[PDB]
Amino acid sequence: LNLERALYRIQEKRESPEVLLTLDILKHGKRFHATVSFDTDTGLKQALETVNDYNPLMKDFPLNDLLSA
Amino acid sequence: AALVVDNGSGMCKAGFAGDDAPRAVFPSIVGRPRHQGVMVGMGQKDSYVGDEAQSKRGILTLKYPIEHGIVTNWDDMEKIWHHTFYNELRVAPEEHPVLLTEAPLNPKANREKMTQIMFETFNTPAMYVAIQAVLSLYASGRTTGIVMDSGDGVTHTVPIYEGYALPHAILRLDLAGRDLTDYLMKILTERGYSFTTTAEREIVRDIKEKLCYVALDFEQEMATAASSSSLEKSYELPDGQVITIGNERFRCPEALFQPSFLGMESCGIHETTFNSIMKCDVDIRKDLYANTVLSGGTTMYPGIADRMQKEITALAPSTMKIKIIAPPERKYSVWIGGSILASLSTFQQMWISKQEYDESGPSIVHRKCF
Amino acid sequence: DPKYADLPGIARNEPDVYETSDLP
Amino acid sequence: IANQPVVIDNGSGVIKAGFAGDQIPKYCFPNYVGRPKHVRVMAGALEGDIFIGPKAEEHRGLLSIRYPMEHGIVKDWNDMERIWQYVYSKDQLQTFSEEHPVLLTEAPLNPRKNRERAAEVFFETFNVPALFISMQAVLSLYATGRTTGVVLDSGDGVTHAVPIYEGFAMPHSIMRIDIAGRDVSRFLRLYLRKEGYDFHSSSEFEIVKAIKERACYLSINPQKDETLETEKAQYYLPDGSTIEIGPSRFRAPELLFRPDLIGEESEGIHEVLVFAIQKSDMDLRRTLFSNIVLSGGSTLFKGFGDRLLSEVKKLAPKDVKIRISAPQERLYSTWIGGSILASLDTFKKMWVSKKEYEEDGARSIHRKTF
Amino acid sequence: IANQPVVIDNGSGVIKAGFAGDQIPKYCFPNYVGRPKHVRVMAGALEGDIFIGPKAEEHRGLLSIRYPMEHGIVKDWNDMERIWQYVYSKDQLQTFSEEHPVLLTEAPLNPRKNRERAAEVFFETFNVPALFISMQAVLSLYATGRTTGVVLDSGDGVTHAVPIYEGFAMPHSIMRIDIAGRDVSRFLRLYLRKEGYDFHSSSEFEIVKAIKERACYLSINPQKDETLETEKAQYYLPDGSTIEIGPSRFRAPELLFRPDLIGEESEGIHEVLVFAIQKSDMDLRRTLFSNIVLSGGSTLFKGFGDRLLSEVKKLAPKDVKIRISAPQERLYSTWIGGSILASLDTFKKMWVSKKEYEEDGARSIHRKTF
């Protein structure tokens, strides 16, 4: 749960227009593999994808139904 | 890693994946001597590839399988390619995938013929062919833009809006500098500079690159240049001959602005590009006004951007600001665009392997075009 | 008025109340 | 979870959203279902393949704008899947389906089917905690503070009069029609072809709507101004192209009063509202003359209500004081009314719990919708 | 005037002419405006530089042929005037405007400017006593004898469906699309460049039209007949030279139903006609279904109508019987219908006198016409 929380938060930090704008700065400034070597070096896609994979399993769990009760 | 092989309509360029300087910078021209009653000169080649043909240019019949890019005899260029390997990199094509160039409105049989040469002949592990304009915009670093691509054998403005297929406005145009050189040597013939073979053409195309520029008001500049006797500049050629060119320098590229000189039944390059512009959404064409991507090595001309710009500016509204994109390295940006394009992650998967071709035949060229 | 500025699709210079010229 | 509920200011042409208590919705956007129509040539191109928001508000030259809410009435539930799918974006939400209660709105005289299928969506696919969907007229009255009032509300392919006295069950007296600005703008495309403007895209239609809200007004004299010579207001594109208008700007809304101009029998907004008046009572009618709630952005025109005042003055008898109420936010009046209504404690019964619909069905809510 | 009325079959691509008292047009020719692309010094060539008839029908590779009716809309009216003078000339009529009643043709919802400009010619330059110009649909109605129906008049470069029951207009159902066979011929040279055939001239476009009207049809199954192996029929040039065809001959008019190939949105005019059907009355539709009006020479394809019947089966409900109304000489059918209309004596109110033009002109045109 907290994984996905921080994943989306850091994801939005990444998705800020300054970061993406600088990727544009570099690649249009002939530093041609900013988004290439950037997006490929991100596991954020796969991590969020894994939380989406295990999404209904981590959900509706009877944790407090047994521990708290 | 791969083989970034550029196929220049005039000269050539090549190298591996990610190489910066083009290695095979040589004339992509074919040549053979006058195979006659005389014997061989101490043993020598039959066909003369580029610089070899350029060397002994007085007899070697400078030809081209290339018909404004359309290669007729593929045997020529493929032997050139073999020697090009074993000339520049000395690497076999079977270990590294190849990357090639193309121009739109090309008969698919050409590319399929090419393809089967790479597989049946060259046995490349993987292969790919793409448009030169893509590499030009790639070197620019954009995805939205009218890439006016201009080879020295062909011309094709490429309007793009975020890397998307807009072929209805993209139009191939067999406009070669060779055509200008044809007309040029012709008008030279009436100027006392009567010359015939293609060797003459090589010298004068280099002279075209020397002093043939683009003026701003062709008729006014023509009258003033007629009055400007000093503008009729001379140059003692490799042979004892000298030249005289004041009008000719800019008199010759007006054929591009005016098909009338050749009777091409077309429009001038500036409004031709504007016609290609007219085949789109005018509000995204606004971006294209800003995306004035002047590309192709046959745009390395003095006073060409302002000329073209001003022309289409007269055609454009005041708010429609022309914003020229034209680095002087656009000639190399084709091959260098492909060279750095080879280093693309998705492109390392986007391939045409041996069995991929063989098991699909030449049909795979269609979807594996772009 | 401030909310009238906050959103774009809002025009002015027209009274929100339209009534008849109720002849007294 | 029952946190601050999401007040969704729906709409035929403009379906937007915000929250309760707030006076500014953070997600203001219209109805538009577009998607690119080209092939990604150059990699790195911006994608999503279903463009809404800045994508659609940026890449207008590539999308096929679709519309399920034909006359506000949804015809494509798959388009609704995509609409909420974009709505459900966190950059569009910052939440989940359960993080906040939802407050969706409606239009009177609609089938159950709509509520049924939508309940399936937001309580099965999406899993909304609490939600109730009903007419926007009530919310508009909330924003006026009035209770007794004829809500003249118009969508964009919808125009209707809602007579209300303290929100009473009067569906026989309450009227509704589904015809407006979408069709008027389409008729303006007809105007374009008559003028010579060869346009047939939905992106162009957007620009026509920009003119509709921008370079289009009303007059009060139909035939008089028709005989009066116009000026042909030259509109300018984003490109800046001269686009004359003439009297067409107010000629097209005459159809809103003269429905047969498009070939559709009706009686015009005014007479339909008068029919709603007929179903009311003489004493209450005078109140409703004083209680006129004009609403809808489509109602934004020069002397719109003033012309309509003259119309009803020619309709209503003597000594009838007609009074119109029409804020400048004839859109958010519904949004703020939902922002208030959603902010109520009695509202528990007004909303519908998730599990409730999950128990038996939407017919229970159809009992709750009346 | 009490003379024979000039019956002109002014089609966008085929502009024929004749009189009413004649059941066959004697002056038939297509749309063409040629200007000599070559200089002439030595005597032997005739001049005028705007050639109609024989000169244009022989010296195709010499004259820059223009098709001034851009989608049936001409802006180079001057050329058309000269063509009309050519009609007044010895080769066609040897008469005057004042000397005869005249009759031209029209398209629905044309830009008023064109009608005004035409009236300027025929009542200022030319001075026809009584004249009226109308839709080609009425001409077709005379060619069928029918009065009920959806006139599908789809000529050279315009496609339109005209739903009219018993001689009663329904403009909201009446649709018009300014694109047809001319563009399929454009697409045919697009096929030429697909396999490298730079036949860019208008004369070359006529050669393209010769193939279009010589070896082209409609295979009723789209992919089932497209994906097969083609025999590549060797067409014979205006030299008789062999040129293969491919799937091209039948897959070329497919674009008329999927305009996405050219980068356009439409439905296939028959579906627009189905929309008109939907715009009509339920059981009154069935009649129009049986009113399969076939007009415009572009309809000439083998399996054309049957492919459209298949379209009907894919889109229309069961037993709503459709009945093909084919014309024998479709192009003359229009002209003969015009001959019938021009031969109507009652045409008094239907015509427009010259003095009427002198009274209001444009206002009287659009006033008296629809």
Ligand SMILES: Nc1ncnc2c1ncn2[C@@H]1O[C@H](COP(=O)(O)OP(=O)(O)OP(=O)(O)O)[C@@H](O)[C@H]1O
């Ligand atoms: N200084 C110069 N002055 C005039 N023209 C120049 C100059 N430099 C280059 N050119 C033009 O560049 C052309 C060759 O460049 P270009 O890149 O088009 O060759 P190419 O073989 O067509 O390559 P490709 O086929 O890959 O586009 C010549 O025709 C010449 O007109």
Ligand SMILES: Nc1ncnc2c1ncn2[C@@H]1O[C@H](COP(=O)(O)OP(=O)(O)O)[C@@H](O)[C@H]1O
């Ligand atoms: N100035 C204007 N003139 C005409 N139409 C307008 C104007 N402003 C907004 N509109 C239209 O009115 C509609 C908004 O009214 P609303 O009740 O929100 O209707 P909708 O149901 O279409 O969202 C919008 O869809 C918009 O197209």
Ligand SMILES: Nc1ncnc2c1ncn2[C@@H]1O[C@H](COP(=O)(O)OP(=O)(O)O)[C@@H](O)[C@H]1O
């Ligand atoms: N066999 C054919 N195949 C396709 N198109 C044809 C054929 N015969 C004629 N046409 C097209 O139809 C046109 C004639 O139709 P017509 O109604 O006269 O067009 P218009 O009225 O627009 O001149 C010709 O100009 C030609 O382009």
